[PDB]
Design a protein around this motif. Sequence first.
Motif, PDB file in Angstrom:
ATOM      1  N   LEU A 205      -6.104  17.612  -0.850  1.00  0.00           N
ATOM      2  CA  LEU A 205      -5.873  17.311   0.559  1.00  0.00           C
ATOM      3  C   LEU A 205      -4.943  16.128   0.732  1.00  0.00           C
ATOM      4  O   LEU A 205      -3.891  16.244   1.395  1.00  0.00           O
ATOM      5  N   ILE A 206      -5.353  14.991   0.189  1.00  0.00           N
ATOM      6  CA  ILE A 206      -4.699  13.720   0.495  1.00  0.00           C
ATOM      7  C   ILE A 206      -3.298  13.654  -0.098  1.00  0.00           C
ATOM      8  O   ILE A 206      -2.425  13.019   0.485  1.00  0.00           O
ATOM      9  N   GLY A 207      -3.120  14.287  -1.250  1.00  0.00           N
ATOM     10  CA  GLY A 207      -1.800  14.399  -1.894  1.00  0.00           C
ATOM     11  C   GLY A 207      -0.860  15.427  -1.308  1.00  0.00           C
ATOM     12  O   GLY A 207       0.304  15.512  -1.738  1.00  0.00           O
TER      13      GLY A 207
ATOM     14  N   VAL B 128      -3.402   5.504  -0.227  1.00  0.00           N
ATOM     15  CA  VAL B 128      -4.010   5.856  -1.496  1.00  0.00           C
ATOM     16  C   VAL B 128      -5.059   4.818  -1.892  1.00  0.00           C
ATOM     17  O   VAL B 128      -6.181   5.175  -2.319  1.00  0.00           O
ATOM     18  N   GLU B 129      -4.698   3.543  -1.779  1.00  0.00           N
ATOM     19  CA  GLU B 129      -5.607   2.466  -2.154  1.00  0.00           C
ATOM     20  C   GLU B 129      -6.890   2.476  -1.328  1.00  0.00           C
ATOM     21  O   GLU B 129      -7.996   2.306  -1.868  1.00  0.00           O
ATOM     22  N   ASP B 130      -6.750   2.727  -0.032  1.00  0.00           N
ATOM     23  CA  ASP B 130      -7.895   2.792   0.865  1.00  0.00           C
ATOM     24  C   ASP B 130      -8.759   4.036   0.594  1.00  0.00           C
ATOM     25  O   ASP B 130      -9.973   3.949   0.720  1.00  0.00           O
ATOM     26  N   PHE B 131      -8.148   5.157   0.221  1.00  0.00           N
ATOM     27  CA  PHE B 131      -8.945   6.287  -0.302  1.00  0.00           C
ATOM     28  C   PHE B 131      -9.858   5.871  -1.450  1.00  0.00           C
ATOM     29  O   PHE B 131     -11.070   6.125  -1.416  1.00  0.00           O
ATOM     30  N   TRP B 132      -9.287   5.258  -2.482  1.00  0.00           N
ATOM     31  CA  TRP B 132     -10.099   4.898  -3.661  1.00  0.00           C
ATOM     32  C   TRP B 132     -11.148   3.854  -3.346  1.00  0.00           C
ATOM     33  O   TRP B 132     -12.272   3.940  -3.861  1.00  0.00           O
TER      34      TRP B 132
ATOM     35  N   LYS C 121       6.978  15.462   2.579  1.00  0.00           N
ATOM     36  CA  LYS C 121       7.136  14.251   3.396  1.00  0.00           C
ATOM     37  C   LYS C 121       6.493  13.039   2.732  1.00  0.00           C
ATOM     38  O   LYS C 121       7.194  12.110   2.427  1.00  0.00           O
ATOM     39  N   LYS C 122       5.166  13.033   2.536  1.00  0.00           N
ATOM     40  CA  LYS C 122       4.570  12.108   1.571  1.00  0.00           C
ATOM     41  C   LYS C 122       3.629  12.923   0.697  1.00  0.00           C
ATOM     42  O   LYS C 122       2.556  13.302   1.141  1.00  0.00           O
ATOM     43  N   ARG C 123       4.074  13.242  -0.506  1.00  0.00           N
ATOM     44  CA  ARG C 123       3.287  14.032  -1.446  1.00  0.00           C
ATOM     45  C   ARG C 123       2.964  13.184  -2.661  1.00  0.00           C
ATOM     46  O   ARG C 123       3.758  12.324  -3.064  1.00  0.00           O
ATOM     47  N   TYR C 124       1.792  13.421  -3.243  1.00  0.00           N
ATOM     48  CA  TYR C 124       1.430  12.790  -4.502  1.00  0.00           C
ATOM     49  C   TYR C 124       0.823  13.838  -5.387  1.00  0.00           C
ATOM     50  O   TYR C 124      -0.027  14.642  -4.942  1.00  0.00           O
ATOM     51  N   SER C 125       1.229  13.821  -6.648  1.00  0.00           N
ATOM     52  CA  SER C 125       0.552  14.616  -7.645  1.00  0.00           C
ATOM     53  C   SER C 125      -0.819  14.047  -7.959  1.00  0.00           C
ATOM     54  O   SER C 125      -1.136  12.886  -7.694  1.00  0.00           O
ATOM     55  N   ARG C 126      -1.627  14.895  -8.557  1.00  0.00           N
ATOM     56  CA  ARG C 126      -2.910  14.496  -9.067  1.00  0.00           C
ATOM     57  C   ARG C 126      -2.748  13.289 -10.026  1.00  0.00           C
ATOM     58  O   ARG C 126      -3.473  12.291  -9.877  1.00  0.00           O
TER      59      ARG C 126
ATOM     60  N   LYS D  61       0.812  -1.227   0.000  1.00  0.00           N
ATOM     61  CA  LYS D  61       0.000   0.000   0.000  1.00  0.00           C
ATOM     62  C   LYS D  61       0.844   1.275   0.000  1.00  0.00           C
ATOM     63  O   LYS D  61       1.955   1.286   0.554  1.00  0.00           O
ATOM     64  N   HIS D  62       0.325   2.346  -0.608  1.00  0.00           N
ATOM     65  CA  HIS D  62       1.017   3.643  -0.672  1.00  0.00           C
ATOM     66  C   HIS D  62       0.525   4.572   0.451  1.00  0.00           C
ATOM     67  O   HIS D  62      -0.607   5.053   0.402  1.00  0.00           O
ATOM     68  N   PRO D  63       1.353   4.806   1.473  1.00  0.00           N
ATOM     69  CA  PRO D  63       0.904   5.624   2.588  1.00  0.00           C
ATOM     70  C   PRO D  63       0.689   7.105   2.265  1.00  0.00           C
ATOM     71  O   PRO D  63       1.428   7.714   1.495  1.00  0.00           O
ATOM     72  N   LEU D  64      -0.330   7.666   2.892  1.00  0.00           N
ATOM     73  CA  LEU D  64      -0.566   9.092   2.877  1.00  0.00           C
ATOM     74  C   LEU D  64       0.197   9.719   4.029  1.00  0.00           C
ATOM     75  O   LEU D  64       0.493   9.054   5.036  1.00  0.00           O
ATOM     76  N   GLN D  65       0.471  11.009   3.906  1.00  0.00           N
ATOM     77  CA  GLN D  65       1.113  11.750   4.994  1.00  0.00           C
ATOM     78  C   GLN D  65       0.264  11.762   6.257  1.00  0.00           C
ATOM     79  O   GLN D  65       0.798  11.620   7.367  1.00  0.00           O
ATOM     80  N   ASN D  66      -1.050  11.877   6.074  1.00  0.00           N
ATOM     81  CA  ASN D  66      -2.014  12.009   7.159  1.00  0.00           C
ATOM     82  C   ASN D  66      -3.081  10.949   6.988  1.00  0.00           C
ATOM     83  O   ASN D  66      -3.355  10.490   5.865  1.00  0.00           O
ATOM     84  N   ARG D  67      -3.634  10.545   8.128  1.00  0.00           N
ATOM     85  CA  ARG D  67      -4.859   9.790   8.190  1.00  0.00           C
ATOM     86  C   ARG D  67      -6.033  10.793   8.132  1.00  0.00           C
ATOM     87  O   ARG D  67      -6.013  11.861   8.766  1.00  0.00           O
ATOM     88  N   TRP D  68      -7.027  10.454   7.319  1.00  0.00           N
ATOM     89  CA  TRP D  68      -8.163  11.329   7.049  1.00  0.00           C
ATOM     90  C   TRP D  68      -9.444  10.594   7.397  1.00  0.00           C
ATOM     91  O   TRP D  68      -9.502   9.373   7.338  1.00  0.00           O
TER      92      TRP D  68
END
Lengths: 180, 12
Positions: free
Chosen positions: A105-107, A37-41, B1-6, A4-11
């Motif tokens: 936000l998530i990115g 990211v996967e859990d977002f989608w 820190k953990k960034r993703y583009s669109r 899984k690809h982690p996000l910076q923050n939990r939302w």
Amino acid sequence: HYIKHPLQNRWALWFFKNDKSKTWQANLRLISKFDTVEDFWALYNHIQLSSNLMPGCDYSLFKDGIEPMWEDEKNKRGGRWLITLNKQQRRSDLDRFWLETLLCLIGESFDDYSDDVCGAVVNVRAKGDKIAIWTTECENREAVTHIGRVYKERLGLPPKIVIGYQSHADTATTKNRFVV
Amino acid sequence: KKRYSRXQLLXF
Ligand SMILES: C[n+]1cn([C@@H]2O[C@H](COP(=O)(O)OP(=O)(O)OP(=O)(O)O)[C@@H](O)[C@H]2O)c2nc(N)[nH]c(=O)c21
């Protein structure tokens, strides 16, 4: 791909159901929380689109531990960048704008001002739909105005079109503290 | 820190 690809923050995704017989806070519902990211989608792809919500309903996406209300410690000194949309294109464009907002936000699209972001809210309303980014401190000019500018850019609003930031305290008691 | 583009977010 297998990891899984982690996000910076939990939302946390929240839903507000329009029910006039209850108090505003009781109509809030925590839907779910995610930090990849996967859990977002997986969440996004299996919930109802904003364009299919009843008027008076909301979706909110907020950092874990921040409730999507003025009264939260992280919101009460803060405010929102507000976008008010024409009703005609809800079917065509509300969902697109809300998803673009979620991805900002998530990115972590707000660069070094990520800590100031609390969340975002979409209001489905008869008088015009609204999307807003909520930030933690109305006095943090640099952060607020950077977030504004990046957000405006990501929605594709041209230089001509000005958007405004208002403090929650002012809304709840409206002029723009800042514009970009 | 953990960034993703669109585009990185959407390709999932
Ligand atoms: C975001 N928010 C909204 N409300 C309540 O819901 C009402 C409607 O606020 P709204 O944000 O749903 O705007 P709407 O478009 O429905 O109406 P507007 O005021 O003309 O923009 C407010 O007057 C408050 O009573 C809120 N009440 C509390 N306690 N805390 C909140 O954070 C909050």
